[PDB]
Ligand binder design. Structure first.
Ligand code: HEM
Ligand SMILES: CC(C)CCC[C@@H](C)[C@H]1CC[C@H]2[C@@H]3CCC4=CC(=O)CC[C@]4(C)[C@H]3CC[C@]12C
Length: 468
């Protein structure tokens, strides 16, 4: 076994060989870390699934970790996770299967100019899917899944302009595969889950280059990713298809619960709904956009979308409460980490992690942290508030659902645009209400801890009726 040495943080080895604290950590991730915070302070080491994870819990120490250091490796763990879960060979250039910098691929196609067409495509696709008036009762999460999945799929992978059952099949397959994702990350083989195994292979088949080339309006991302698969990799046809499944999962898995919580919190709070309705009404008027189901589709520019402070605040506050990401980096060699709490010795191949849900729900940073306050990221005038403090010091990192530094989601700008577009269209098309307005906020499904946004454990019913 491993023993704590000179300078090294307090070590918690756990009661199980290999797993260590994994079981206890999985049982209640936030309370497990909070209990270790009381027992060991802001810096402690946990043996998890064969690894030794140093947790940095002081929000004032996040900057020393999120920096581009010569001792950190921020790809090796992610690349391995992807390989195991999606069933492709190593995408690490050191392994010689590809020479592609996937980070460069994502930057080039999810940001800058590429973002314009991608944003424009999402708005067209959403409107295609969403367009005597009667009240339709449905599960809010079920609704958000239908709408966001189909729109997201068509925006990223283009349209087959030749078929409704096929969209429904991909939808169902994705639900079946995504259901066992926490187990796949843990190390359990997909073979063990027959339904999910078949689902993953069916998803992969439809994303083969031969099937993708037959589609209209493919994203610059996938068309670049196809080109680089052929030019810079030695992957087989199915492996190439599985690299597109990684991108499908990445574009859907966090957007769907993110969309649910934003929609839910906006309707649940009458104050948030009234403000958002007025903002969308104001924005559409100034852009000369008329909401008509039979006429021409609405068009909003990136500039118009980025100037929605109320919606931005609603999304940010929705993510603040539901984000459960695990910010990880690995030690390249043995070194000493210098933090506000002290100096700690870290060994080679050790993991240095952040669980920013500890910060998002910190009462010292966010007063009444478990309450949804729609204007939490707004000032007196109604402009985005970027100043948050912690024990007197102004915080550089205060909101991290997409991560930060080099370990940041490249799809963040698109993610916020597509949620905004869904909310704009939902407010413009329908009259919205809940089955039980005075019903409790659903508990977060903790089985998805470390994988991004936590979905609700149980779905909430809601009603919608198109406007005249
Ligand atoms: C609410 C929406 C989303 C959330 C909260 C989210 C969150 C994240 C987080 C936390 C990571 C890992 C950050 C880290 O390295 O510690 C990540 C990675 C990534 N996300 Fe997002 N994401 C979202 C939407 C999207 C969308 C719409 C796309 C579209 C393509 C996307 C593409 C990716 C990709 C490709 C990576 C991996 C980057 C790399 O390893 O090189 N994400 N995202
Ligand atoms: C060309 C492809 C093979 C690119 C591969 C991208 C892989 C490495 C990326 C895409 C989406 C990323 C995940 C996004 C969601 C996420 C949230 C977290 O809080 C921890 C890290 C994870 C679990 C990420 C791990 C690495 C993933 C799976």
């Amino acid at each position: 076994s491993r023993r704590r040495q000179t300078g090294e943080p307090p070590l918690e080895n756990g009661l199980i060989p290999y797993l260590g604290c994994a079981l206890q950590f999985g049982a209640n991730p936030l309370e497990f870390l909070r209990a270790n915070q009381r027992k060991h302070g802001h810096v402690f080491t946990c043996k998890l699934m064969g690894k030794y994870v140093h947790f940095i819990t002081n929000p004032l120490s996040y900057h020393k970790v999120l920096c581009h250091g010569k001792y950190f490796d921020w790809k090796k763990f992610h690349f391995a996770l992807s390989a195991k879960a999606f069933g492709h060979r190593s995408i690490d250039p050191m392994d010689g299967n590809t020479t592609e910098n996937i980070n460069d691929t994502f930057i080039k196609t999810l940001q800058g100019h590429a973002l314009n067409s991608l944003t424009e495509s999402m708005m067209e696709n959403l409107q295609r899917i969403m367009r005597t008036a009667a009240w339709v009762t449905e599960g809010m999460y079920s609704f958000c899944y239908r709408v966001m999945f189909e729109a997201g799929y068509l925006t990223i992978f283009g349209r087959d302009l030749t078929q409704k059952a096929h969209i429904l099949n991909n939808l169902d397959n994705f639900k079946q595969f995504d259901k066992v994702f926490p187990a796949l990350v843990a190390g359990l083989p997909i073979h063990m889950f027959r339904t999910a195994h078949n689902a993953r292979e069916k998803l992969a088949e439809s994303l083969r280059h031969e099937n993708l080339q037959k589609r209209e309006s493919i994203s610059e991302l996938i068309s670049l990713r196809m080109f680089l698969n052929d030019t810079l990799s030695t992957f087989d046809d199915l492996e190439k298809a599985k690299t597109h499944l990684v991108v499908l999962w990445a574009s859907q898995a966090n957007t769907i619960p993110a969309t649910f919580w934003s929609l839910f919190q906006m309707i649940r709070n009458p104050e948030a709904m009234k403000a958002a309705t007025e903002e969308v009404k104001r924005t559409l008027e100034n852009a000369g956009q008329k909401v008509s189901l039979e006429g021409n589709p609405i068009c909003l520019s990136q500039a118009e979308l980025n100037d929605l402070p109320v919606l931005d605040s609603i999304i940010k506050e929705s993510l603040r409460l539901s984000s459960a990401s695990l910010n990880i980096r690995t030690a390249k060699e043995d070194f000493t980490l210098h933090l506000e709490d002290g100096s700690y010795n870290i060994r080679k191949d050790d993991i240095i992690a952040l669980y920013p849900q500890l910060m998002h729900l910190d009462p010292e940073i966010y007063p009444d942290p478990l309450t949804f306050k729609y204007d939490r990221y707004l000032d007196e005038n109604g402009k985005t508030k970027t100043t948050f403090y912690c024990n007197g010091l102004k915080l550089k990192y205060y909101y991290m659902p997409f991560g930060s530094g080099a370990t940041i989601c490249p799809g963040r700008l698109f993610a916020i645009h597509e949620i905004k577009q869904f909310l704009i269209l939902m407010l413009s098309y329908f009259e919205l209400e809940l089955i039980e307005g005075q019903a409790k906020c659903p508990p977060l499904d903790q089985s998805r801890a470390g994988l991004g946004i936590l979905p609700p454990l149980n779905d909430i019913e809601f009603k919608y009726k198109f406007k005249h």
